[PDB]
Every structure is written in structure tokens, then in C-alpha cells.
Amino acid sequence: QGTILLDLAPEDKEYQSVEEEMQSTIREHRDGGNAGGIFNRYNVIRIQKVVNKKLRERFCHRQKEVSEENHNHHNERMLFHGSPFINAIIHKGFDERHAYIGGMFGAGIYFAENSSKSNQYVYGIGGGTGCPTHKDRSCYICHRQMLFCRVTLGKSFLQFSTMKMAHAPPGHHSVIGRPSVNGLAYAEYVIYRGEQAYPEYLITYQIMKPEH
Numbered sequence: 001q002g003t004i005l006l007d008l009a010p011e012d013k014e015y016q017s018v019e020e021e022m023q024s025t026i027r028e029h030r031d032g033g034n035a036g037g038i039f040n041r042y043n044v045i046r047i048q049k050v051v052n053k054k055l056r057e058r059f060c061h062r063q064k065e066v067s068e069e070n071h072n073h074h075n076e077r078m079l080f081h082g083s084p085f086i087n088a089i090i091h092k093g094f095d096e097r098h099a100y101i102g103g104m105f106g107a108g109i110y111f112a113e114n115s116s117k118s119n120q121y122v123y124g125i126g127g128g129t130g131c132p133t134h135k136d137r138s139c140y141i142c143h144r145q146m147l148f149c150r151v152t153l154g155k156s157f158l159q160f161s162t163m164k165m166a167h168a169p170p171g172h173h174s175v176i177g178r179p180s181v182n183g184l185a186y187a188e189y190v191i192y193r194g195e196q197a198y199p200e201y202l203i204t205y206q207i208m209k210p211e212h
């Protein structure tokens, strides 16, 4: 009972595959690097597979209900997630009860294909006040954490804005906020049921300073 974190050896193919997806999904943001920091590569310090029997079962049960409703298509995808609550998530699983309508966000759990997008949220909306110790959004000292999870999207509802939503629209199971020239630059993937995502990998890392 409870979660078991298993370290992967950097020689393991799985490890290598998770780190390349993360390093290669780094993009520039019209941020000036304000939110997530200035860098063009990560120092992956650790990758652990999150093993939890109960969470895997809740996940598989919900995936069945979604397939039934989506013509036997659960439409699963591997996506990143960044937030100050990773440690609670890896233990109790994703919980929609901690999501609220506010700002540009609705009351759901947001995910991203670009790890640099998830990095912007590791310390809070807009990066918050940065790391706890140095209150620096571009801190190269403190260790950050993000999750590469399995996400059951089922039938997604394509929109431009994700604020104002409490649940997926009728007949749907997830919402996708898409690129608008006066809105998002990258797609946002939202679920309103924590059981629709399984935190497969726990990534410990740091952003590295641009080399001179």
C-alpha cells in the first residue's frame, strides 16, 4: 500500500526516452523567460517511475468508462505537468478538488506537450515568486520536479479559452485550449477528473544557465 518510486538507470532505454522528450520539448516563450527562467537545456538529475497499485486501478477503471463513451477510443497521451503539488500528487494521485476557476484557468488539471510550458508552473501561476529559498524564478540552484503522465483524453472539446469551465462539455471527457493569435501560443490539455491521469514519471532536474 502506498506509492513506490523506482529509480531508472540513465542507461535504461526508458530513462533515455523520458529525458529526450523533455529536453526536446523546450521552446521559447514570449516570456523573456520571466515565468520559467532563462535556459535552453535542463540538468536531469533523476527520473523515478511512480508505482502505485490502487492509483493504477482507478486509472484503468476510468479509462474503461471513457472508451465505452468514445467508441472504444480512450485517446491516451503522454503529457507533462508542472505544479507546486507534485509530491502530494505522486502519493494520492491527481485530485480535481484542488482545482479552481480563476484567471485564465478553469476548475481542472492542465497538462502540456512542451516541458518548458510545464516548467513555468512549477513554482506557481506565472512561476509565482520563484523558488522557496531564493525567491528566484530563474534559480539554477534549487531542484525542480515535473511529471510525465498518462492522460486519458477520450473525446476532447476544442476551444480557445479554458477559463469558466468546471467540467468537460456534455459527451466529452477533456478540453483543449488551442492557439489563438490573441490568446495561447501552445495547446493546453485539461481534465476535470483526477483519475483521468496517471503520474507515470517523476522528473527531478534543474534549469541550466545559457553557456558562454
Ligand SMILES: CC1(C)OC(=O)N(c2ccc(-c3cnc(N)c(-c4ncccn4)c3)cc2)[C@H]1c1ccccc1
Pocket: 082, 083, 084, 085, 088, 089, 092, 093, 094, 095, 096, 098, 099, 100, 105, 106, 107, 108, 109, 110, 111, 121, 124, 125, 194
Ligand atoms: C492552473 C491549475 C488549474 O493547473 C493545474 O494543473 N493546477 C492544479 C491544481 C491542483 C492540483 C492537485 C491535484 N492533485 C492533488 N492531489 C493536489 C494536492 N493534494 C494535497 C494538498 C495540495 N494539493 C493538487 C494539480 C494541478 C492548477 C495550478 C494552480 C496553482 C499553481 C499551478 C497549477
Ligand SMILES: [Zn+2]
Pocket: 131, 132, 133, 134, 135, 136, 139, 140, 141, 142
Ligand atoms: Zn533557489
